[PDB]
Symmetry: C3
Subunit: 28 residues, 3 copies
């Protein structure tokens, strides 16, 4: 599961970047 | 080695995502 | 290969985080 874990962590990071970019957008 | 290093890269990124989400939240 | 793909995904993420930190900095001013 070492490679599996890494791919799931990378997947998760895209949802966190999305969350953040929407909050930045709102401020502008 | 090169494979191992990916876990430290991920660690770094998760810490900075946390920081950023908290900083944005705090502002709003 | 698997390493190649992952290095590009990490690059991509650091570029987006960089952009965000600069944009956040600008806002706090």
């Amino acid at each position: 599961g070492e490679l599996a874990a890494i791919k799931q962590e990378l997947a998760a990071i895209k949802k966190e970047l999305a969350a953040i970019k929407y909050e930045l957008a709102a401020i502008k």
